[PDB]
Design a protein around this motif. Structure first.
Motif, PDB file in Angstrom:
ATOM      1  N   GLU A 151      16.614  17.299  16.472  1.00  0.00           N
ATOM      2  CA  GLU A 151      17.462  16.202  16.923  1.00  0.00           C
ATOM      3  C   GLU A 151      16.656  14.912  17.039  1.00  0.00           C
ATOM      4  OE1 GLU A 151      19.541  16.855  20.622  1.00  0.00           O
ATOM      5  OE2 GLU A 151      20.722  15.020  20.387  1.00  0.00           O
ATOM      6  N   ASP A 206      23.069  12.996  16.705  1.00  0.00           N
ATOM      7  CA  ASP A 206      23.726  12.759  17.990  1.00  0.00           C
ATOM      8  C   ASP A 206      24.240  11.320  18.016  1.00  0.00           C
ATOM      9  OD1 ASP A 206      23.699  11.586  20.703  1.00  0.00           O
ATOM     10  OD2 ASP A 206      23.196  13.595  21.383  1.00  0.00           O
ATOM     11  N   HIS A 253      22.452   8.758  20.400  1.00  0.00           N
ATOM     12  CA  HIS A 253      21.140   8.348  19.922  1.00  0.00           C
ATOM     13  C   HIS A 253      21.232   7.516  18.647  1.00  0.00           C
ATOM     14  CE1 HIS A 253      19.103  10.520  22.988  1.00  0.00           C
ATOM     15  NE2 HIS A 253      19.645  11.675  22.635  1.00  0.00           N
ATOM     16  N   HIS A 289      26.080  16.368  17.747  1.00  0.00           N
ATOM     17  CA  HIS A 289      26.375  16.057  19.150  1.00  0.00           C
ATOM     18  C   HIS A 289      27.211  14.795  19.230  1.00  0.00           C
ATOM     19  CE1 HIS A 289      22.835  18.285  21.375  1.00  0.00           C
ATOM     20  NE2 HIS A 289      23.810  19.105  21.015  1.00  0.00           N
ATOM     21  N   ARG A 345      27.428   7.118  26.558  1.00  0.00           N
ATOM     22  CA  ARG A 345      27.286   8.564  26.717  1.00  0.00           C
ATOM     23  C   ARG A 345      28.381   9.192  27.592  1.00  0.00           C
ATOM     24  NH1 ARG A 345      21.313  11.645  26.669  1.00  0.00           N
ATOM     25  NH2 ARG A 345      22.056  13.168  25.113  1.00  0.00           N
ATOM     26  N   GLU A 372      28.454  16.515  24.014  1.00  0.00           N
ATOM     27  CA  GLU A 372      27.285  16.448  24.884  1.00  0.00           C
ATOM     28  C   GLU A 372      27.324  15.110  25.602  1.00  0.00           C
ATOM     29  OE1 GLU A 372      22.559  17.308  24.371  1.00  0.00           O
ATOM     30  OE2 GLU A 372      23.366  15.481  23.436  1.00  0.00           O
TER      31      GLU A 372
HETATM   32 CO   LIG Z   1      22.175  15.343  21.723  1.00  0.00          CO
END
Ligand SMILES: [Co+2]
Ligand SMILES: [Co+2]
Lengths: 269, 268
Positions: free
Chosen positions: B149, B182, B185, B208, B214, B243
Motif C-alpha cells: 500500500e 487507497d 492516500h 481501500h 478520510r 477503510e
Molecule cells: Co488504506
C-alpha cells in the motif's frame, strides 16, 4: 468461422532451442498452408521467453488463439481436483501462469486433463472440487477466458460429454468459461453429435477437429458434413482448430490435407 | 467487484475477550449493512485463536479478504527495512505468522507501515533491503499473497505512489506481490488517479476507500465516480474495502453511508 492449426512443441526447460525451432517450423507451416491462427500447448510457461514468441507471431501475422495446459497434469501431476489441497493450489498457480501468457495473445486457456480424474471418488465430489477451483481461477483473473474440453473415457472419468460440461458451466455461471468440443473425443462419447452441439449453442467457444482415427480430417470416417451444417445453424464463428496426429505422411502433409477438407466444408456453408 | 468493510479490533494480547467482542460486532454490522466480506488488522496473530474466528466467518457466511499488519510497526517497532538485522528478522517472522492466518481465509496480507521508513538512509538502500525481505517472505511462504500500500508523505518516505510500487514490483518479479491503492492516500500523492490506476492495471490487487477527509465515502470531496469508471474499464473484479474514520456519526453510521455511496457507484 476461422481455421487454426495445433502445433506440437518440445518443452523448453530442457531444450529452449528445440522449443523455438518447433514453434517457428509449425507457425511457418500453418501460414504457408493458409491457417489464420495457431494453437499451442505448454507445460510450464515460466521457462519460455514469450517476448520472442510475440515477435514471431507479429512477423508471420499469425495470432495464437488457444493455449493447452494438459502437460501440467501428464508431466507434473498437477490437477485442479487433486485430493491433496497443496497440489490443487499448485495447479491453480500453474494455470494462472498460462492465463498471463494468454493475455499477451488474446488466447483461450484450455482446461483439459489439468482438471484431474475422479481417483476413486464420487463424481459429485470431483465436480464440486473442480467448480471451486474454476471459481478461484475466475477470482484470480480479470480477463482470462477458459474452455472445458470433454475427453473420452480412456483419458479421464471426469467430464466425458458436452452435457457433463454444460452442467458445470451452469454451476460456475460465468461467460468467461465455455466449451471446447473435439470431434475425435465426441466420436466415442456423444450419442448424436449435431444434437450435442445444438445443446451447447452459444457456450461453444472453441472447436478441435481430427478424424475418427485422429488423423487429418478426411482420412477416417467421421461425418464432418453434419457437424459443419450444425455449426452454421448455431452461428458458430470462432476457431476450428486442427488437432491431429501427423498422419498420413507427416505433420506437413496432415496439416495440408486437413486444411483442404475443412475449407471445402466451410466454403459450401 | 465486491464490497468489504475494515473493522477495528482491540489487541487480543491485552484483552482477548475485547477482540472477540469487537470482531463479532464488526462482522455482524458488515453483514447487516450488506458487505460481502470484512478486512481486519492485527498486531500479533500468534495470540489470537483463529479456529473460532473461522467458525464465526462460517456462521455469518462472511469471508475475511485481507489482514493488516501495520501495528507490528507502530506498536512493536518491527520493520522489513529495519537497519538492525535481528529486528528485521523478527519482522519477517511476524509477517510469516500473518500469512498463516491469511491462508485459513484465502486473504491478502497487507504490507503498509510494516515496510518501515528510510531513517536517514538513501532511497536505494532502503529499497534493496525491502526487496530482500520480500524475497525472503516469498521463500518462507508458499502460497501467501502480499499487497503493497503506497502511503502519503506524512506516514512514510518509502513508497508514496503507485508508480513507485510498480517499479519495486518489477524488481521483486512475483505475481504473489501486488498493489493496494487507497483513495485517501492517493488524494494527496497521485497526480491523476484514473491514470495511476490504469498503469497499475492487473497489478492492482486490493482497494481501500475513504473520502478526502478520510470520512465515509460521500462525506468529503473525493471524485469516486471517475475512480469507479476506471475500475470498470480495467475489469477490476476484486475487493473494494471501506477503510475510514468512524465519521460521521460513529462506526455503524459511517459503514452505512459508505455502503450506500459505493453500492450506487457499483450499481452503475
Ligand atoms: Co488504506
Ligand atoms: Co482436443
Amino acid at each position: 468461422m476461422k481455421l487454426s492449426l495445433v502445433i506440437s512443441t518440445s518443452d523448453a526447460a530442457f531444450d529452449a532451442l528445440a522449443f523455438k525451432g518447433d514453434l517457428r517450423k509449425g507457425m511457418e507451416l500453418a501460414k504457408r498452408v493458409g491457417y489464420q491462427a495457431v494453437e499451442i500447448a505448454v507445460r510450464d510457461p515460466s521457462i519460455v521467453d514469450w517476448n520472442e514468441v510475440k515477435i514471431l507471431s507479429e512477423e508471420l501475422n499469425l495470432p495464437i488463439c488457444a493455449i493447452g495446459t494438459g502437460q501440467a497434469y501428464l508431466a507434473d501431476g498437477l490437477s485442479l481436483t487433486h485430493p491433496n489441497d497443496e497440489i490443487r493450489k499448485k495447479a491453480i498457480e500453474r494455470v494462472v501462469k498460462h492465463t498471463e501468457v494468454a493475455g499477451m495473445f488474446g488466447a483461450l486457456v484450455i482446461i483439459g486433463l489439468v482438471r484431474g480424474r475422479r481417483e476413486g471418488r464420487s463424481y459429485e465430489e470431483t465436480e464440486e472440487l473442480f467448480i471451486e477451483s474454476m471459481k478461484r481461477l475466475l477470482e484470480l483473473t480479470e480477463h482470462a477466458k477458459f474452455v472445458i474440453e470433454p475427453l473420452n473415457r480412456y483419458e479421464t472419468d471426469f467430464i466425458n460429454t458436452i452435457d457433463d460440461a454444460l452442467r458445470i458451466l451452469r454451476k460456475i455461471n460465468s461467460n468467461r468459461v465455455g466449451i471446447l468440443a473435439d470431434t475425435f473425443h465426441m466420436n466415442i462419447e456423444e450419442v448424436n453429435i449435431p444434437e450435442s452441439l445444438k445443446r451447447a449453442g452459444e457456450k461453444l467457444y472453441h472447436f478441435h477437429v481430427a478424424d475418427s482415427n485422429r488423423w487429418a480430417p478426411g482420412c477416417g470416417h467421421f461425418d464432418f458434413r453434419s457437424v459443419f451444417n450444425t455449426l452454421k445453424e448455431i452461428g458458430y464463428n470462432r476457431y476450428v482448430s486442427v488437432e491431429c496426429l501427423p498422419l498420413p505422411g507427416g505433420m506437413e502433409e496432415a496439416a495440408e490435407i486437413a486444411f483442404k477438407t475443412l475449407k471445402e466444408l466451410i466454403i459450401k456453408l
